[PDB]
């Protein structure tokens, strides 16, 4: 039970935002901006690729992802370097992995350039998904009140 009041959420997502330890499953090109089946099919495909690489001795990249007013950022764990950056306006859909409580993904990109990014979280994926929901809702609300800049 975490506090999700507006004031708390602003302090939560400002600056570097919230960080989560995870592993990158992969990135797949998709045909649309949203869709439950679209995402589950992509997640299943990417995991299949990872499983095939895992049989060859390959492991997923260790990362940490942050959720902030800057959107979703993926950093390499070993070096701390920023590897992927998807702005809030570029993210269209968030989806939990129906078969894995520790995996989720999101669709990003403009029309005709959609990609599904799959993440295996160190702990439960739920808190990450809820943070994204809260972040997007907050930005929508602040924008409607013309106060996003005063809180970002």
């Amino acid at each position: 039970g975490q506090d999700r009041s507006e004031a708390t959420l602003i302090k939560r997502f400002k600056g570097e935002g919230v960080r989560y330890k995870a592993k990158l499953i992969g990135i797949d090109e998709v045909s649309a901006a949203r869709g439950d089946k679209l995402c589950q099919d992509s997640m299943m495909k990417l995991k299949g690729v990872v499983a095939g690489a895992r049989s060859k001795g390959e492991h997923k990249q260790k990362i940490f992802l942050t959720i902030s007013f800057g959107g979703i950022k993926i950093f390499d764990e070993k070096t701390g370097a920023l590897q992927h950056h998807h702005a809030v306006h570029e993210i269209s859909y968030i989806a939990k992995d129906i078969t894995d409580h520790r995996a989720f993904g999101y669709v990003c990109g403009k029309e005709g350039n959609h990609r599904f990014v799959a993440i295996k979280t160190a702990q439960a994926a739920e808190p990450v998904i809820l943070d994204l929901r809260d972040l997007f809702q907050l930005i929508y609300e602040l924008k409607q009140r013309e106060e996003l800049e005063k809180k970002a």
Binding site: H89, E90, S92, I94, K96, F136, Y140
Partner: peptide, 10 residues
């Protein structure tokens, strides 16, 4: 699962 209210298609 949910849609991002702030997503911009273009």
């Amino acid at each position: 699962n949910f849609d991002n209210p702030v997503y911009r298609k273009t």
